[PDB]
């Protein structure tokens, strides 16, 4: 039973810095025919697999050039020259020269890019929610540069916890920003109960918190 | 134009039946073999099964004693079929085309879009939808209290696709799934344009199209 030991599981990488990708096998790939069957694919957010490189180091057509592959035996790698934004996503080695073939783990390439400040948005509940007895306040972090964020939610000046949940997307494929909503959850009565909603939020590139806020 | 789409059932409950559907197109399977892979929730790629284009399967270690791979060429569909389903299985399963080689394909050529199986003993639910109101304006829709995954959120029938950021779904501890789709748009165009998100929620065959209003 044949291992495929990929690393690392995340890789950081500046624009237009190089990628290496590591693949080791727990035996030889090598088929008796001869060839030794190792394909790579990239698996983009919300995405499908896709084929970059097979046969340790062929490109498939209309993948760049700055995608290769090398190796033999045990030892596999997966270099990519200057990384661009769209190469962002999950890396996977394929091993089928032995029944049964197997993936790696996977390699996540996280972009590094410029610092890059939130927009933040605040939605009050809607009136078709309130009129069936539960209000959602949502706060929204749009397109910002690195992951972390600090939001706080603030109700009458009173700091919330334990009644909120976030959600943040994967990296962008464009320009490699994250966005976040975080949303706090009450009863109609318990949210008709107070008067100033309040959506605090902490980040690298604010120069000190910005709150967004409404009155009920 | 060569195609492959996954067709499940949503959600199974455990130690019962699954029985997903790959219909093929562009391409003859007297002459592909086909994969199958699956990838349970924030996990690893995983190889499931493979039916050669002479009609002998092999399988995966794990899953074998409870997997069966079967075909018909002649109405172009692969057939997944597994039994005693446990919460393990939850996953998105893809079925992919063989390309190249003689008798072991150089690798996968094309994929399917995948088919969402939660293994679970809930029953479904439709999500309630919930605008989230509006030189830059972002607008929204609160899609909540729905089960299995997942929802499908559209902008204007497709048309309006720039600035969509639709969030991954959220577990609630009511057991029911909630996210929402936001998009920023111009301002200006407020009192212009209207603007109404397409929520399609397939286990519950629940179609929802909201208008959201300034
Ligand atoms: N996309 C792919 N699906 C599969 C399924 C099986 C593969 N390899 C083998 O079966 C190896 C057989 C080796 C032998 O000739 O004994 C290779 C493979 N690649």
Redesign the interface.
Known sequence: ?LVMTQTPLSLPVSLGDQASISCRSSQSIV?SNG?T?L?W?L?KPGQ????LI??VS?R?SGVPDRFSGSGSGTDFTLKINRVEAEDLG?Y?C?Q??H????????TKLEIKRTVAAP?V?I????D??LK?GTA?V?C?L?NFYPREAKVQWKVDNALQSGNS??????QDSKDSTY?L?S?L?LSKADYEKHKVYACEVTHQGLSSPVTKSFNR | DVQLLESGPGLVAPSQSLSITCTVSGFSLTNYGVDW?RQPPGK????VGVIWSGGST????ALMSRLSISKDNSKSQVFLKMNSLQTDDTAVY?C?KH???YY??????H????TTVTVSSASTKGP?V????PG?A?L?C?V?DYFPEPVTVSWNSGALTSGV?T????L?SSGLY???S?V?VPSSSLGTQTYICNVNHKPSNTKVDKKVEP
């Open positions: 039973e088929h060839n069957y394909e694919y698996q499908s697999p896709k084929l097979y046969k062929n498939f999950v996977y394929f089928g020269s029944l049964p073939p197997t993936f790696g783990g996977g927009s948005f939605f009050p509940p809607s078709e929610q069936s959602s949502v929204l749009n949940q976030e959600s943040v997307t994967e966005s909503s949303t959850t | 892979v690893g790629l995983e190889w092999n399988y995966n270690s893809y992919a390309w190249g080689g072991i394909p150089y690798g996968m050529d994929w399917g879009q995948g309630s919930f605008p989230l109101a830059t972002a929204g609160l909540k950021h969030f991954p779904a959220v609630q909630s996210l929402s936001v920023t």
